[PDB]
Design a binder for these strands. Structure first.
Lengths: 178, 132, 144, 60, 260
RNA sequence: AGGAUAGUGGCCUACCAUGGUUUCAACGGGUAACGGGGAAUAAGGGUUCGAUUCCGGAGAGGGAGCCUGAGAAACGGCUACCACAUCCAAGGAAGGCAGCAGGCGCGCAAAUUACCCAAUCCUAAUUCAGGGAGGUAGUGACAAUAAAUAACGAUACAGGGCCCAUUCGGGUCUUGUAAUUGGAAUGAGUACAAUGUAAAUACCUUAACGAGGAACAAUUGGAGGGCAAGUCUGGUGCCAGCAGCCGCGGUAAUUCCAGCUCCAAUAGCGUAUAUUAAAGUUGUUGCAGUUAAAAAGCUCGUAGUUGAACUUUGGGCCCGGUUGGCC
């Protein structure tokens, strides 16, 4: 009841280039996150490989392939134009990272950087629906895109300015008619 | 307490225990988060028990806050409550007194001492040499 | 016809052939006969505590030239006497005689390492503290 | 195999080093910030003669 | 060893009670009773886990020690009483008569029935013997001995029992064209109108069955249980009727059935 | 044939006969051997592990014997012998943690003499008692999951995309560097409270307090190749030491000792041992055998392995399934 694994060659500069580019583009702190997405993608790919080896119009193929496709579609990784169980193999880590929330925050605006987006998420701001979320790796399901907003709490979306403004109001505005 | 907004989901009647058992859902923005006894009052006000045939527990808050969910009971009589509900909940609600008993290992030591049968007379006077 | 039997009922010959021919790789022979538990001062263990009998200067193998500053160590669970290398410039001063050390393997899975002849182990700890820590002055040796 | 070797010479160089002390310098960021830093330092600034780059080039 | 086990761990309990395993600890061991350990359902499970009338074993005991609940017209205040197939459970709270039957996935379907249907139950005769003083008796699947039955009641037939008097009202023979409720096996909970039978002396008599969808299958006669004729069962059947809609049909349903 | 057994049976004996197993590996020896479900790693085939959280075998220091009972060859039950060992007013008496917690030894190598029956369930003449079973917390970097250590501006330097497509007009902006500076966001940590709980501690909630660096300061390994990362500085000078391997070091060390800079993984990183892949370097899939290791000196020959071709083909006529494709 536990799980995860990592890569083979510890070097190979081409990989390092690609990984660091993805990390800079998507606001990541580790290679473990890219490794995690590649792991998920590998599970998906080998499942679809087995199903494609099976016969067409085979019940297990139909069932599990339609299920996998439905899951990836409702996450938004697999576009609804390509729904045939071969782009599931053609998928990529960019296509998953684009559906991460941090990336979705930035691309939806609202943060003016992916690093600012990560900070806002982990600082008890952005909520999804009404549930507050503090995990950049969240995988929006294509429908909460129109529900990502600042929280009812969380200044920039609501109530008390918190600490710094609250204290500077007393350092400054109270300190007027001493 | 701004729009405390209690709701009761999944209501089951249990006549063979004489209760209504349900799920309490509190929507509690911008306050000190629940007040179980406020729930007891607000819920007896709608289920007609006045305080004490109502038992309620579990009450986890959603991450981010503003909402909590727990389990709730409302009985048809305080007597039925005092016989069916357990004593730790009755103590929580003040409808009973938690007995002042000895520690567990002390009770056990006492039992193991009392497993040895005697009291008659002046043979009392030489128990300094039992185990030493 | 490739020597081996291909017949559908030749599985006995094939597997008995394997059984007889697996006794030509070193790892299999080691595992099965048991050489860790019979030979090998560490009885199939990774580490072993020992008492320092002596300090030693082993002259390196050619074409190098140096003295490697090892110790003769008596093991506690076997009584076997063993040479072990003290790395990390100094640390022969941080060990002393009749000190309890902890030895580990010197890396090459039995066989010896580099220019040090006869030596198969290295010192990791002295009197409960790591030589790395003592060398980087993160800790100091207990004298009392 | 060998008893004779003058163990006095141990610790020679580490004792004889001209001890230099570490310069206190600004604090480097840690984590996500460091990856940002490296992405900049790689895909912004440096290259070298007609096809090349180096990441720790000595002064020349 | 050294005498019989009194405990039963979570993971060892039959899968059709549905609780939790990894060091979740213990499970309720059915006491000795009319039914077998695995092919049974204790009342603690029927009441805490299925109906949700209770949350704890002490609550279940508080229920059972009030003569509220009775199995086959008899109270059975035992917590781990093994109730089984075609057993009638009667609660005067809500006047709910529960028949224990099987859903198609093999769990114990919680069938609610009328009092007139709870008046009786059914029983598969396991053996027919002469007892002492030349008195014939039949033994059912629920360990019920019945003396002096109709002499035409041969083995594997089923019997209608009045449950207040342990007497026989009517019997149904084992023949082709008779309904069947499979008890035990992979094909547990299916209902399929015996096609024919395969003898195999000394070798576990087999039965070939045919669902209403003409989905033929095969089971073992020890696992077969007749209940009536073609299209005229003797019990109210559960929601599903023993068809085993495949996983594909099931998802087609619960996607087109309802957007909720 | 009898006896014994709950019962079968050389189980035990009486009489009788002389059989039974074995190169299709008997018997014997070894096992750092409880067995399985299963674990690790594998394109596929496979190799290794499996003391364990299920299942069943055993055992309660070693042996043996037995009472009671439905059930024990019982050990938190007796009897004896052996070995260890406690109390003593020396006459005798009482023992068995491979249950719980301790932490004497052994060692490379493993936690609190804690709280509780509130859950899981079990036992009992039993809804009420008991339960170190079990749960709860404490220690715990065994392993796993998520994931902070900072984000955004303005002025001085090196560039510019797009809005009004009305000339160098304002700009919702933009890529890096500052003994430049701002207000914003917090949480880790304290903590009134309630919640949680058998009762507490924590988690989830949450008033109040809680960042500007000299501060709430991330290490671990390396920078010759393999193998990402120094044609920098100082020291030492076949010494000290590095180095898994190849190799550095002998007065200009890209390898040692340090500083600076840089790299890799990162709350994790090294080292040792073992094992798996790599290893088609065990080769059924799938090796090799003239000369690199290996064709027996040659023939016969049993087991084993392997073994030529041939026996109803072909043609029709209907029935009803799954797929297409007019509409």
């Amino acid at each position: 009841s536990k799980t995860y694994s990592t890569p083979k060659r510890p070097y190979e500069s081409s990989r390092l280039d690609a990984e660091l580019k993805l990390a800079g583009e998507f606001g990541l702190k580790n290679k473990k996150e890219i490794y995690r997405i590649s792991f998920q993608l590998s599970k998906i790919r080998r499942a679809a490989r087995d199903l494609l080896t099976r016969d067409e119009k085979d019940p297990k193929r139909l069932f599990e392939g339609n299920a996998l496709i439905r899951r990836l579609v409702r996450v938004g990784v697999l576009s609804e134009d390509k729904k045939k169980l071969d782009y599931v193999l053609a998928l990529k880590v960019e296509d998953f990272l684009e559906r991460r929330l941090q990336t979705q925050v930035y691309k939806l605006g609202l943060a003016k950087s992916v690093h600012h987006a990560r900070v806002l998420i982990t600082q008890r701001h952005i909520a999804v629906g009404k549930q507050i979320v503090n995990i950049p790796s969240f995988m929006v399901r294509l429908d909460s895109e129109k529900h990502i907003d600042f929280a009812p709490t969380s200044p920039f979306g609501g109530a008390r300015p918190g600490r710094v403004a609250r204290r500077n109001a007393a350092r400054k505005a109270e300190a007027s008619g001493e | 307490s701004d729009a405390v907004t209690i709701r009761t989901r999944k209501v089951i009647s249990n006549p063979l225990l004489a209760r209504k058992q349900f799920v309490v859902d509190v929507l509690h923005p911008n306050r000190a988060n629940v007040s179980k006894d406020e729930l007891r009052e607000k819920l007896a006000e709608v289920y007609k028990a006045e305080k004490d045939a109502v038992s309620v527990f579990g009450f986890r808050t959603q991450f981010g806050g503003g909402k909590s969910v727990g389990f709730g009971l409302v009985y048809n009589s305080v007597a039925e409550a005092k016989k069916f509900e357990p004593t730790y909940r009755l103590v929580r609600y003040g409808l009973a007194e938690k007995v002042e008993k000895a520690s567990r290992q002390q009770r056990k030591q006492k039992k193991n001492r009392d497993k040895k049968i005697f009291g008659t007379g002046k043979r009392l006077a030489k128990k300094v040499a039992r185990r030493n | 016809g490739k020597g081996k039997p291909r017949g559908l009922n030749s599985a006995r010959k094939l597997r008995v052939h394997r059984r007889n021919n697996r006794w030509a790789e070193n790892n299999y022979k080691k595992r099965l006969l048991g050489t860790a538990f019979k030979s090998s001062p560490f009885g199939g263990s990774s580490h072993a505590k020992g008492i320092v009998l002596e300090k030693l200067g082993i002259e390196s193998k050619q074409p190098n030239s140096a003295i490697r500053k090892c110790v003769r160590v008596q093991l506690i669970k076997n009584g076997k006497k063993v040479t072990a290398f003290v790395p990390n410039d100094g640390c022969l001063n941080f060990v002393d005689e009749n000190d309890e050390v902890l030895l580990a393997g010197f890396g090459r899975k039995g066989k010896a390492k580099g220019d040090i002849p006869g030596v198969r182990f290295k010192v990791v700890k002295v009197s409960g503290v790591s030589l790395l820590a003592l060398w980087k002055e993160k800790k100091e040796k207990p004298r009392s | 195999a060998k008893v004779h070797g003058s163990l006095a010479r141990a610790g020679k160089v580490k004792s004889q080093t001209p001890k230099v002390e570490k310069t206190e310098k600004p604090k480097k960021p840690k984590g996500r910030a460091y990856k940002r830093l490296l992405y900049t330092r790689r895909f912004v600034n440096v290259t070298l003669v007609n096809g090349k780059r180096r990441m720790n080039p000595g002064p020349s | 060893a050294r005498g019989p086990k009194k405990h039963l761990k979570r993971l060892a309990a039959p899968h059709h009670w549905l609780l939790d395993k990894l060091s979740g600890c213990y499970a309720p061991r059915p006491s000795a009773g009319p039914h077998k350990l695995r092919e049974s359902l204790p009342l603690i499970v029927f009441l805490r886990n299925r109906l949700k009338y209770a949350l704890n074993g002490r609550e279940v005991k508080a229920i059972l020690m009030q003569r509220h609940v009775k199995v086959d017209g008899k109270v059975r205040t035992d917590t781990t009483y093994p109730a089984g197939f075609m057993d009638v459970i009667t609660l005067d709270a809500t006047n709910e008569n529960f028949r224990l039957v099987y859903d198609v996935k093999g769990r114990f379907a919680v069938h609610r029935i009328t009092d007139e249907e709870a008046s009786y139950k059914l029983g598969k005769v396991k053996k027919v013997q002469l007892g002492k003083k030349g008195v014939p008796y039949v033994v059912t699947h629920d360990g019920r001995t019945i003396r002096y039955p109709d002499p035409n009641i041969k083995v594997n037939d089923t019997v209608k029992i009045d449950l207040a008097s342990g007497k026989i009202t009517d019997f149904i023979k084992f023949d082709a064209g008779k309904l069947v409720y499979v008890t035990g096996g992979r094909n547990l909970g299916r209902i399929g109108t015996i096609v024919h039978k395969e003898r195999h002396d000394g070798g576990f008599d087999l039965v070939h069955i045919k669902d209403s969808l003409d989905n033929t299958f095969v089971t073992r006669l020890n696992n077969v249980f007749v209940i009536g004729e073609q299209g005229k069962p003797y019990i109210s059947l559960p929601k599903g009727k023993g068809i085993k809609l495949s996983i594909a049909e099931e998802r087609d349903r619960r996607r087109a059935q309802q957007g909720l």
